[model samples]
Target: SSSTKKTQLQLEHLLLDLQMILNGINNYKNPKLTRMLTFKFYMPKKATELKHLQCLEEELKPLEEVLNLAQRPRDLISNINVIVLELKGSETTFMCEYADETATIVEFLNRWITFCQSIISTL
Candidate 1:
């Protein structure tokens, strides 16, 4: 048998990669400069210290909720798409379609960082 305990560093590093991409998205300039961008979105489909993964899942659940709560759900972030490819164990790759009018994307990320930050703080 094997123990699937996630280190604090491992969790932090995952979100850190996401934050890098979020920063890049925020710095994006000129819709004319590029209509399409691509990046990897990180997530976990597995668990170590089951409660830790559950906490992570709980935090992430609200992200899409924010999207659904919006008025123009179809228009705002429609250009963005995430195709998740699951690797073995807890590893997963999200191929994200980074595109125009990222205000929605920005909001999504802002919420994500905030949520993750809150989670990390408690852990």
Candidate 2:
């Protein structure tokens, strides 16, 4: 179970990075994007910028660490791949100038949070 202990620690670290990314998204100063966290609605203000895109791009490195660390766990490897793909999808949409893309990223982060909870519970 020591391996599991290690996994748990890595997962906790991933959870922290996920939180940081989500918090950054929450405070993003997107000119054409507005979100209603209370009701979980995402609205487009009028249209968008590369600044937020760059901000999110910087998060991929830390996010990738969990995937790298999960080589021994089949389940974690699979789930980590899913998260990475979701982030890539967001990257594409955001690159296409979708100002409301933070909503999608936020949703992805929530998914990541739940996955971390489930996996960490077992570990």
User: Which candidate gets the maximum TM-score versus the true structure?
Assistant: 2
Candidate 1's residue-wise lDDT over 72-122, tens digit each?
434322212210111122464333333343334455455455644655565
Summarize candidate 2's per-residue lDDT along 12-118 as a digit string, tens digits. 76567667656755554444234323223232332123123233334444344433432233444345444444433444544223246444446656755665666
Of candidate 1, the 10-residue stretch with the lowest lDDT total is 79-88
Output the number of the lDDT-best candidate: 2
| TM-score of candidate 2 relative to the true fold | 0.43
Q: Clashing residue pairs in candidate 1, if any? A: none
TM-score for model 1? 0.38
> Backbone clashes in each candidate structure, one number apiece?
0, 0
Model 1, position 8: C-alpha lDDT score: 41
In model 1, where do residues sit more than 4 Å from their true spots?
1-5, 32-103
